[PDB]
């Protein structure tokens, strides 16, 4: 094998993978239904569950997250696919029960673990319809102490004027992405709103699942793991650049697609706004 998912390939990731930049030094928060330890092409630094039902959380039943985290950084060797930062330290958080949802108390909690546990990169695959001040305190504080968070959203599409963006979404802090294919065109089931801040792939991306193999997800939660990939990896050449900085880094330097409402600002480009 050796195959790589074009997933990134589109953002100029495979690139930096050469110089030596393999997202090393950074820990990434992949808060989701879980990630597999089992998997031959996975390496987990740790984790801790926050909701009492599936309470290792190194067994994932669902694949939302084992898969997400997949695009995050999947072992590089003769095993298949790869991401942005294949050799970052995966932190696996489960705030959901999997094959269902869970409560902001589970969303808010593991995402203060990964921030008050010195996690550099945070990947939040989920979107909520409304959010509180409680969700606004940890997103504001996880962003005020070094962390840079990215969250999903897209699965509600258009509404004319009213925007369809999840929480963490409509707030300033945080950078919510969306899904693109390769045509460099939007996606039907992809969220729009004054908030969209940048855009990545997210459609029929191969990766790894429970059991021992991969499979195909299409959605907007698989896009978020693109950012927070380059994210780890933009902290590669400057283990010492802030949140703020790298914020403008990806955002500062993308490719034009459409209006600041389904398009954001463009696509991910590693070796451009990440230098």
Swiss-Prot record:
GO terms for molecular function: metal ion binding; serine-type endopeptidase activity. This is Subtilisin BPN'. It catalyses: Hydrolysis of proteins with broad specificity for peptide bonds, and a preference for a large uncharged residue in P1. Hydrolyzes peptide amides. Its EC number is 3.4.21.62. Belongs to the peptidase S8 family. Ca(2+) 2 binds at residues 169, 171, 174. Its main location: secreted. Residues 5-274 form the Peptidase S8 domain. It comes from the Bacteria. Secretion of subtilisin is associated with onset of sporulation, and many mutations which block sporulation at early stages affect expression levels of subtilisin. However, subtilisin is not necessary for normal sporulation. Monomer. Binds 2 calcium ions per subunit. GO terms for cellular component: extracellular region. Ca(2+) 1 binds at residues 2, 41, 75, 77, 79, 81. Keywords: Calcium, Hydrolase, Metal-binding, Protease, Secreted, Serine protease, Signal, Sporulation, Zymogen. Optimum temperature is 48 degrees Celsius. It is found in: Secreted. Subtilisin is an extracellular alkaline serine protease, it catalyzes the hydrolysis of proteins and peptide amides. Has a high substrate specificity to fibrin. It comes from Bacillus amyloliquefaciens. Its cofactor is Ca(2+).
């Amino acid at each position: 094998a050796q195959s790589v998912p074009y997933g990134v390939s589109q953002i100029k990731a495979p690139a930096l993978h050469s110089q030596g930049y393999t997202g090393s030094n950074v820990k990434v928060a992949v808060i989701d239904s879980g990630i597999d330890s089992s998997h031959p092409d996975l390496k987990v630094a740790g984790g801790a569950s926050m909701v009492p039902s599936e309470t290792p959380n190194f067994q994932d039943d669902n694949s939302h997250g084992t898969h997400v985290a997949g695009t995050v950084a999947a072992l590089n060797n003769s095993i298949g696919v790869l991401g942005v930062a294949p050799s970052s330290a995966l932190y696996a958080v489960k705030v959901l029960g999997d094959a269902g949802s869970g409560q902001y108390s589970w969303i808010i909690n593991g995402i203060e673990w990964a921030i008050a546990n010195n996690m550099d990169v945070i990947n939040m695959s989920l979107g909520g319809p409304s959010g509180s001040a409680a969700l606004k305190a940890a997103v504001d504080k996880a962003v005020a102490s070094g962390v840079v968070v990215v969250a999903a959203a897209g699965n509600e599409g258009s509404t004319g004027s009213s925007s369809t963006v999840g929480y963490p979404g409509k707030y300033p802090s945080v950078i919510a992405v969306g899904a693109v294919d390769s045509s460099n065109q939007r996606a039907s089931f992809s969220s729009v709103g004054p908030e969209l801040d940048v855009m990545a792939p997210g459609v029929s991306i191969q990766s790894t699942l429970p059991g021992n193999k991969y499979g195909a997800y299409n959605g907007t939660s698989m896009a978020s793991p693109h950012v927070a990939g380059a994210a780890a990896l933009i902290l590669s050449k400057h283990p010492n650049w802030t949140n703020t900085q790298v914020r403008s880094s990806l955002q500062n330097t993308t490719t034009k697609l459409g209006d600041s409402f389904y398009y954001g600002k463009g696509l991910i480009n590693v070796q451009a706004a990440a230098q």
